[PDB]
Amino acid sequence: RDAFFESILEISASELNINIQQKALEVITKYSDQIWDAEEIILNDNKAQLRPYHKYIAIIKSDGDSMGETIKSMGAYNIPITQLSKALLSFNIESINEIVAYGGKPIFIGGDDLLCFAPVCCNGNNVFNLVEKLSTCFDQCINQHLQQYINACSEAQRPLPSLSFGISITYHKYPMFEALHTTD
RNA sequence: CGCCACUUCAUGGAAAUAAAUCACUCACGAAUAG
Ligand SMILES: Nc1ncnc2c1ncn2[C@@H]1O[C@H](COP(=O)(O)OP(=O)(O)OP(=O)(O)O)[C@@H](O)[C@H]1O
Ligand SMILES: [Mn+2]
């Protein structure tokens, strides 16, 4: 209710325009194992257009780099932290928008982290394309809101705040606990 | 006009030179874990 997508395979092959949730529910009609198996064999006999990247799952984890250091650097130049809050919130909203646009799934947070469950390739768009768009969105929000900090601390020299990225691509099997720890 | 032969029996040069020296495809696939 306060929110408004499961298994591991449905968002690995969200490109065929095929609704595995509906057919899996029809077949099954405790829960997770049976529907997991149903989705598995449904896209097993969807072999006609199934490429090897349709069975691989990409986990994307990102965190903000030196946020406290950026805060301390803005403190020297008399720059409010409200601008940083603005940039982070706008980046998070745009991140959710473009992650659902790409074909993946946002899971974790709209803070300075992001854990996304995305297919390797949907509509000819990579997970690396998704990472590039996320980085560009974060840079755009930083520049748009911290413009004062941008043209005040970057002329002489400084690295601007950025986000480091962690991507893990594994089979739909090979459970996602180990994959999550590998991503971490 | 008559008569009649002896000689000489491979040397020098080139003796391999360039091109290609691996190429493409497959570099794990399923099952068992979740
Ligand atoms: N809306 C916001 N505005 C400003 N700062 C924020 C906001 N939300 C979170 N933060 C900051 O995020 C920080 C948490 O960042 P985190 O600890 O993940 O990374 P870091 O220590 O900056 O980076 P790294 O590990 O790369 O050195 C907190 O110190 C907090 O001040
Ligand atoms: Mn963080």
Side-chain angles (χ1 to χ4, degrees):
Chain A
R1 325 315 195 181
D2 197 22
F4 318 132
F5 88 122
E6 80 145 60
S7 161
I8 198 49
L9 192 300
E10 64 183 73
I11 39 60
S12 100
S14 100
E15 213 279 323
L16 307 319
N17 279 358
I18 58 59
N19 195 2
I20 304 312
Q21 190 136 283
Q22 254 201 26
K23 39 205 85 140
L25 285 188
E26 281 188 7
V27 164
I28 189 171
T29 37
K30 171 67 66 64
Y31 183 163
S32 165
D33 44 6
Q34 215 53 355
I35 178 189
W36 217 314
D37 306 334
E39 290 189 80
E40 280 156 357
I41 39 62
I42 284 160
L43 304 90
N44 276 16
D45 35 22
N46 277 128
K47 194 18 60 183
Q49 291 183 18
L50 196 83
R51 253 73 138 178
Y53 66 85
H54 286 77
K55 36 181 66 164
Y56 273 78
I57 169 67
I59 303 162
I60 306 145
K61 194 164 168 50
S62 42
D63 192 288
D65 291 13
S66 36
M67 285 324 308
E69 229 80 63
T70 285
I71 287 179
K72 298 288 212 53
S73 153
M74 309 179 2
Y77 285 9
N78 325 62
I79 307 204
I81 194 178
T82 65
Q83 282 288 12
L84 192 59
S85 273
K86 241 166 244 171
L88 273 190
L89 202 295
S90 318
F91 163 59
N92 280 313
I93 281 311
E94 287 326 295
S95 166
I96 306 183
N97 291 335
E98 79 101 17
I99 282 193
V100 291
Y102 160 75
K105 275 263 304 305
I107 277 194
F108 221 90
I109 198 168
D112 81 322
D113 315 50
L114 167 54
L115 210 154
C116 155
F117 264 57
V120 187
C121 208
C122 291
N123 313 348
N125 276 314
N126 280 199
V127 62
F128 282 104
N129 282 77
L130 184 65
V131 170
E132 185 57 291
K133 215 180 274 141
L134 282 163
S135 168
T136 316
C137 252
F138 185 54
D139 275 47
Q140 171 185 339
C141 295
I142 283 322
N143 281 336
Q144 202 207 323
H145 285 114
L146 281 162
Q147 171 261 9
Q148 166 37 300
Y149 175 61
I150 283 319
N151 55 349
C153 209
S154 70
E155 308 322 304
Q157 82 305 351
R158 166 153 288 74
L160 294 323
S162 37
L163 74 174
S164 281
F165 263 108
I167 298 129
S168 163
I169 323 174
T170 45
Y171 210 179
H172 53 305
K173 304 168 156 124
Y174 177 75
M176 45 99 96
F177 196 173
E178 319 233 326
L180 224 302
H181 259 89
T182 325
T183 314
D184 299 356

